[PDB]
Amino acid sequence: ADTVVVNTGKEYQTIDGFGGMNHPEWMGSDLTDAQRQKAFGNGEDELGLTILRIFVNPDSNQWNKAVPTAKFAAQHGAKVFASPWEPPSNLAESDSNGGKLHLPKSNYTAYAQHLNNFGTYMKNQGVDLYAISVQNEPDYASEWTRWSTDETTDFLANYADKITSTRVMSPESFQYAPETASWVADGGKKYYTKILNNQKAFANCDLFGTHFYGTQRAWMDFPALESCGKPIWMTEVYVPNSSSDADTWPEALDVAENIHNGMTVGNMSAYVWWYIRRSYGPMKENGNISKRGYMMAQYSKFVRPGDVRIDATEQPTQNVFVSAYKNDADQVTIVAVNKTTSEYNQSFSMGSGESISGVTRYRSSGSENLAKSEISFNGTGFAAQLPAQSVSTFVVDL
């Protein structure tokens, strides 16, 4: 294997965090106090999530259902953002072009007020809502609200400046599909390019969100969006499916590969799962962390808001995926996903020249969950075994 060369002087995106969705209406119950602590604490056997996504109910008389878990997350320092699936029923019309609903242009001002008022309500409930998005999956909307890519751009350019209670997030595409994709009539990356290309829409859009359903690694690179000066969040996914129990192994390792790809190929600042607590989620219905959740935790517990992704040899051997981050205490955190069936010894080196003063490893695999050990080092480098089908997070003191 190539030595993994890490360079603290070459910086990419700032990390906003890692999280999941809470949706009492659709999940059937809210998180309990124990589950809230399990998700948003960063102590022993806690997921260390730092972002919570919440639901914008079309009926404002139901907004209160989102509040208790948002307040808990906010008290533990998490960013809280919200997504709408449908306008208030009085603003929505049946769609005859593939969606269930459509928002008529004549109702855009009222819809922006609906989103603004949700932000104000959250603030009055003690939650400074980080952002609200224009629409969940406007390009996969057979059961909610379809928007064309022109429509979301018009909304952002000409109406979203009146959302002042919170930041404005882009519409959230289903899968970040290539613009010329034959299977998507009007969606995917087109939602984003049209914002970048319209001065008013870009000025009124504070950050971007996309989902990752079926998103290939080869679709994650988006040069114009990655250089525009505003964060891109991956705001919803489950991988590789919802049909398997989240302890299924080695299937769960796909979660770590997907996070790695979003971080290093997509320059994503955030990675947000769907329901936190679910049979296929990071927390099981019995409240314990699943294998998929330990895959998330290898990132979320150690790559914290405000950390900066830095250069590190990304694929030193095929299907061994490496990313690295620095924090404001000058620690470097390296996450190595060995997705192969072979164990080998991997060397690491600080190309930026810093001497190492300590290395601690946390590792998850078929038989380990966040297993902790001390790693020897010498000068500017260290080496470690990477077992087959494992995720190793190295915390490096310089």
| Whether 137 is catalytic | yes
Count of other CB atoms within 10 angstroms of residue 225? 20
Contact assessment for residue 368 and residue 388, using Cβ atoms and an 8 Å cutoff: no
User: Residue 221: which of Na ion, F ion, none does it interact with, CB under 5 to 8 A by kind?
Assistant: F ion
By the 10 Å C-beta count (0-12 exposed, 13-18 middle, 19+ buried), 337 is classed as buried
CB of 372 to Na ion, least distance (A): 25
86 binds Na ion (CB under 5 A): yes
Q: Is 53 in the site for Na ion (CB under 5 A)?
A: yes
11 makes contact with F ion (CB under 5 A)? no
CB of 74 to F ion, least distance (A): 22
Q: Where in 186-215 is the site for F ion (CB under 5 A)?
A: 204
Residues in the chain: 398
Interatomic CA distance for residues 16 and 348, integer angstroms: 26
CB 237, CB 274: distance < 8 Å: yes
Nearest residue by C-beta to F ion?
221
- DSSP helix, strand, coil percent of the chain (3-state; round to 5): 25, 30, 45
- Considering beta carbons, is residue 10 or 372 the nearer one to F ion? 10
In the complex, the smallest distance separating the C-beta of residue 360 from F ion, rounded to whole angstroms, is 29
Q: Which does 14 bind (CB under 5 to 8 A by kind): F ion, Na ion, none?
A: Na ion
Contact between 93 and Na ion by CB under 5 A: the answer reads yes
* Residue 242 sits in the site that holds Na ion (CB under 5 A): no
Min CB(219)–F ion separation in Å: 11
| C-alpha distances in Å from residue 156, one per residue of 116, 122, 132, 179, 231 | 13, 22, 12, 19, 17
Q: What are the beta bridge partners of residue 394?
A: 334, 361
- Which of 25, 33, 128, 221 contacts F ion by CB under 5 A? 221
Single residue of 251, 311, 314, 397 touching Na ion by CB under 5 A:
251
Query: What contacts 31, CB < 8 A, 6 or more positions away?
Result: 22, 39, 69, 276, 277
Cα atoms in the Cβ-side hemisphere of radius 13 Å centred on 146: 19
33 binds F ion (CB under 5 A): no
Q: How far apart are CA 268 and CA 205, in angstroms?
A: 17
- Of residues 257-276, those binding Na ion (CB under 5 A): 272, 274
Taking the complex as a whole, how short is the minimal distance between the CB of residue 320 and F ion, in angstroms?
A: 19
Which of 66, 168, 239, 336 touches Na ion by CB under 5 A? 66
274-333 binders of Na ion (CB under 5 A): 274, 308
Burial 61-70 (b: 16+ CB within 10 A, else e): eebebbbbbb
Q: How far is the CB of 131 from F ion (least distance, A)?
A: 11
Q: Active site residue: 151, 172, 236, 257, which one?
A: 236
Under 8 Å CB-to-CB from 106, ≥6 apart: which residues? none
* Stretch of 237-245, 266-274, 327-335, 370-378 lying at the interface with F ion (CB under 5 A): 266-274
Structure tokens at 96: 């005859």
Contacts with Na ion by CB under 5 A: the residue count is 23
- And the tokens for 201? 């829409």
- Name the catalytic one among 86, 137, 172, 257: 137
Residues that bind Na ion (CB under 5 A): 14, 21, 53, 55, 57-58, 63, 66, 74, 84-86, 93, 107, 109-110, 236, 248, 250-251, 272, 274, 308
* Residues with active-site annotation: 137, 236
Residues that bind F ion (CB under 5 A): 204, 221, 267
